[model samples]
Structures are given as structure tokens and as C-alpha cells.
Target: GLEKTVKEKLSFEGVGIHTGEYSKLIIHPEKEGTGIRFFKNGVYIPARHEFVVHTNHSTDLGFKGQRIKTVEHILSVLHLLEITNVTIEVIGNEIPILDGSGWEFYEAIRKNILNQNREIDYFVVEEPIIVEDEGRLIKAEPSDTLEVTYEGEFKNFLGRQKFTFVEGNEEEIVLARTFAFDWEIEHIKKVGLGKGGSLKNTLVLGKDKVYNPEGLRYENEPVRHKVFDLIGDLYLLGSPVKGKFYSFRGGHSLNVKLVKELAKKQK
Candidate 1:
């Protein structure tokens, strides 16, 4: 019912989604009001929208010349667990890509422990706020709790999918992994991205089927993952938001824009 952090240190090691290289991470407990922060290259960078440097392939945070990549997966799980105060030490340039979803991090933190002696802070939107880019749109409105609904469409087997997330049902969102279409693989490689991507960590949609031998974790996994991302990106505001977020064809850029606007209103 309050703010929390890990009871002890928790460590993880794996290859990154884009870097395709091994990295180590340690989650350390922190005192009250510390907020979530990442330490890399001898610099401490708070996890906030103002520190966000890039959201193209993944959420990257930086200050000066130090940057940490692929932060959404871990941040998403932290937000769900109400773990608000912790120091994440990233030994590599990016976060681990374990299973390409938030489940692994969720399990790791739950397995280690939690400290719940502090109060949780929540920001409730008092009025409707909207942001639109190209054909994509994301909006937030006054609500009793945090809620998210997202719709996604692609060319292949995954035509169009939509999902809504309400409180007490975060696991469903946590389990949805990142994905890509079969046709896009070539472009991704040409651009030198997804260096560590594999079917085990990423879902590949083909013309008529999914490439993974084990199949999808959910029928609408793609769209659910989009909501998962939106939640992680919005948490950059440093506290959970109490509002209903609705998006149509939204991605990281639009999500960040909407969150920045919300932060302004709070000021």
C-alpha cells in the first residue's frame, strides 16, 4: 500500500536487445525519496523525462556523455511493483534482454524481496491532456487509477490489435514481449540493429504465422507490448500516474511527448 524497493541487492546478466552483447545489472535498495536512478560511467542519472536522450529503438537515459540503453523493460516492472527508490548499476551500455519482456525482471525482484516502509506518490490528471504526431495519438484523462488502452496495426499476420489495462491486471502486460515483422528483419539488420535478437527473445510475425517455434505468449502480444512500453515510458515522470491513457497507433515518441505535457501541467 506504499512505496517500495528491493530488500537486498539483485543481479542480472544477459545480452541486450539491440547491442547483442552481454551486460550486468544490479538493483540496490535505496532510502526514502531517493527515486529510481541509474549509475553508469561514474555518473548518476535520475530516471526522469528530462534525462531521456533517445526513444527510437528503446528508452535511453543520459547526462553529459554517459548513456544507458534499453531501460523500458526493467523500468516497466519497477513501476508495476511500486518500487520507487533504488539505484540500478548498469555495467554495460544497455539493460539485459532476458526473454525480451518484463517478466524476468519482475520475477527477479519479487524473488529477492521488497521494502515497503515509505509512502507511494501518485499524480492524478485533473483534466484531459492529448498529444498527436502524424497519425498517432495518445491522451490522458482524469481517473481514479492508472489505466491504459492501446491499438496497433501491422501489415502481416498481425493486422490490427487492441488491449486495455486496468489495475490488478499488470501481469498480462508484463508478459507481452517485444516483436518485429518478418519483412522488417532485413531493414533492422541493414541498419545494424537487433544484434542480439532471437526468436526466444523477440516475436517475428510472418506473412501467415509467427516465427517462434513456441508461438506467441498471447494472441494480441504485439499490441499488449505496446501498452507495456507506454507504461514504462510514462513512469519516467518519477511517479505513477492516476489517469486513463488512451492511444491509437502510438509509439515511444508520442508517449514521451504526452508525458512531458502532463509534467508541465503539474508545474
Candidate 2:
């Protein structure tokens, strides 16, 4: 395999899912070994776990005084494409919540890859690394390739759902949109965050109904979205770590915890 980057520049602009503020982002191709990084207001934040400042509603990165919010969606796209060498220019406060899914983000940058023909190394682990908080847990062990098994249980009718993700078959994962329970909306607004969410970019679930006119893209979409988040958080290693990952009721906090452990293992 070879290190790679997109062949052309790309840009996106839209409402921030958490902040509801209008934001803009740009992607620029880079030379081999450049690694993926974010640039905002003369500050740079590498795609690594150490800069992770928040993981409550979404993954946020900060360096000096510049901060980027809700970055997992875009990072998931870059991780899927295996575009290691790149520069992401953050022109706004957060990455746009495009379609509330990774689908559009993947589509925009999937074509025209420029391979460096230089070999790159995938993070390989032969030992188990586990992280847990309360009852949530995530663990990774030796594997020939990156794989994920997620167990999710929500309070709504969605109930218990499980999904196993194989590296190449990501259509289901990418298509799954982020969701919020009907009752959570009040808390979101009360916190003065999550202002940008709309039916167009989020799956709003009611007491016993789906509020979005389009309904669900898949019956187990919420669980699939977990896989999307897992991949994105794991990609913060700045490269894919080859391991079989398992999770039970894992969210952003647990996901980032697992990543921090893996980063420590690497050192």
C-alpha cells in the first residue's frame, strides 16, 4: 500500500450541528508523510488523540486558542478513503454536519486520489487494549485487519441492536445519520449548543415516532452510526490501527478513551 491524498482541493460550508453556527471547511492535498492535519486561524491541530479536548456531543480538537468542533464526520471520510497526507482548513467553528451522515463527505472526496507510491505503515497491535467507563466499554485485540463489533441499546423503540463492520463494506456505516431522542432536544438547547440540528441533518426521534419525513435510511441506523463514530475516533491515531475492536454501549467518551489507550500503547 502507498500513502495518498486527494487529487484536488475540496470545500464544504453549512450549519454546525452542535453550535448551529454557519461554518466552512477546506481540504487540500499534501505530499507523502505529511499526515492529516487541521489549520485554523494560524494554528494547527494534527489528527491525533492528544489534542482531543471534548467528547461529549462530538469530538472537538484544540491547540493554543483555535478550536474545531464536531470533527468526527469529516475525519471518518478521510479515514475511509485512506488519505493519509492532507491538510484540512477549518474556516469556521465546526465542520458542517453534511446530511447528518458521512455519505456526502465521502462522495465529495472519493474520486481522484493521488497516490505517492510511497509505502505507509498501519498501526498494528498484537496485545489487547481496553477502556471502560461506568458500564460502557471498548476493547481492541490482534487482527489481520481493522474490524468492529458494536452493541447499542437506546431508550427509544430502537432498543438493542448490534452490527459488525468490515473495513471495505462501509456503505451502511456511511449512510447512517446521527440521531437525537425527542427529550434530548430540550437539554441541547438549554446548554446553548446543538442549534444547527434539523430534520435535514439529524434523525429526530419522538416518543413513538420518527420525525424526519425521509424516515430511517436503515432499520439499525443508530447502531451503524456508532460504527461511523468509532472509525472516526480511532482514526485520530493519524492512521488506522489494525485490530478487532468490540464495544458495548460505547459513545464518544468511551471511543476517545480507547483511542488514548491505543496511543499510549504505540509509544
Candidate 3:
């Protein structure tokens, strides 16, 4: 019995946040029992945490000669929307980084809200799931509801930020914007990295001030978006989450590791 169905398919086009290359993403309405899958061009890639590629900056799934970069925001949208079965088709190697937030993705799908044909498939953590990287920690606990805590720190003005997201709090975090530290600009360019990030799309923060002309989407947008990152990372599980996740200074690397640990629940 499907809970609901999408009115139609949705499509979006833009540049990737990290690759800076043009891309088009399509979300096809699907029957619930099918489960979530990431498709490149026309080939299907299972959106499984186990397929998580160890990478920097964002979650990357590289398999069968196909790669998807900076997928956190889009995954966050799918999880927040509780979409059980849908197909994400991308034209380029990465998903578009529209405004560096999940808002664009949410609006794209909002145009065609779909109903699920089967019960939500959730990998409920039967035991504590945890991961650690370079001293940071991420833990998911068995709970009646989904929750998250994201905490991080930067130089002086960026200081530290912490946020807690409990069930029904999806709206507060799903759209939080992504940010780029000013100090990393030169380094990123020096290392030939982050070609897709820009002051226009990302909240560019200087050592002592914010630099985006449009300004912050939220006062603590940095941490809030970091909170959004966790949700999106977990979304790669290929299902809606049904447990609590706690992250302390955890980024792409650590979060991917955490998802792996959580998936091992069946093993």
C-alpha cells in the first residue's frame, strides 16, 4: 500500500558546488518498494552507505567508473522529505550546488510530491553506532525518533557553534546554507581544490568577518549547515532514518565512516 505518490517528475540544472561544472539533476517519481538509487547518466548506483567513497570536502560515491560529488545537500532533501523510493539522475559527475543549500532541491521536488507505495525501509540501529576521525566523534543511538547534534569551531569570530535537531525539526536545518572559510581560499587554490565553490554560492567568511554580499542565510549558518551535512550523510543509507545521530566536529570523512558503522548493524 503506497502512502502517497508524486504528481510528476522534477528536474533541476545548475553548477556543482565543488566541481564548478554545469549539471542537471532529475528526480523521477517511483513506486515505494523500489528504494532510493543514484543514477549517473542512465546507469543506476545503489545509494548505500557501504558504497561511500573515502574523500575530502563532501560525500563521494565512486563505483563502476561513475562518481557523484557534494551530494550531501540533495540527500538531505530526500531524507527530510521522507521519500522512500525515488531515482536521482545526474548529468555530470556531481549534483548541482544551487545556492549551496537544500532549499533548491526541496523546491524542485515540491513541484511533484509523490506518495510511497510501501512502508519506509529503515535500518534502525539496534545498538550504538559510532566512528572517530582525527579526534572528532559521531555516534548514532537507538531512539524512538530521529535526532542530531552538530558542533564545530573555527578561528575567533567563527568560534564555536552547536545545534540539536530532534524529530519534526527538519525544517529548521534542511535549508541551512553551506559556508567557506576565507583562510581556506588561498589554500584551496594553492592546492588546486574547490574549483566549484564561489562567493556567490557559498557564504564566504573571512578570518574576522563574513564576505558574501547576500549575507548569511542564518546567524549561525556555518554550524547549521554542518547539521544539515549530517542528515544528508545519513540519507545515503538508501532509506529514511529512524534513530538519533550525534556529531562533534564531524565532516565528510568522519560522517562516511559513521554511516558505515551504522550499516554494519545487520552484520
TM-score for each candidate, following the candidate numbering: 0.96, 0.97, 0.93
> TM-score of predicted model 3?
0.93
Deviation of model 2 at 21, angstroms: 1.3
Off by over 4 Å in 1: none
Q: In terms of TM-score, which candidate is stronger, 1 or 2?
A: 2
Q: Give stretches of model 2 more than 4 Å off.
A: none
lDDT of candidates 1 onward, in order = 0.87, 0.88, 0.77
RMSD of each: 1.3, 1.1, 1.9
Q: Could you give candidate 1's per-residue lDDT for residues 92-203 as a string of tens digits?
A: 9889999988988988887765767766878778999889998899988999988999988777767888999998898899989999888788887888788999998998
Ordered by TM-score, highest first, the candidates read: 2, 1, 3
lDDT (Cα, tens digit) per residue for candidate 3, span 1-267? 233335677888888877778989878777757777789855787777766774577787766888888778887877777776777888897888888888877776756776654666576777776788777988888887778888887775868888888877777886677887876778766765578888867888887777777787777788889888888888877667778787888998887777776666666
The Cα error of candidate 2 at residue 8, in Å, is 1.1
Q: With candidate 1 superimposed using the best TM-score fit, by how many Å does residue 56's alpha carbon deviate from the native?
A: 1.0
Alpha carbon deviation, residue 196, candidate 2 (Å)? 0.2
Better of 1 and 3 by TM-score: 1
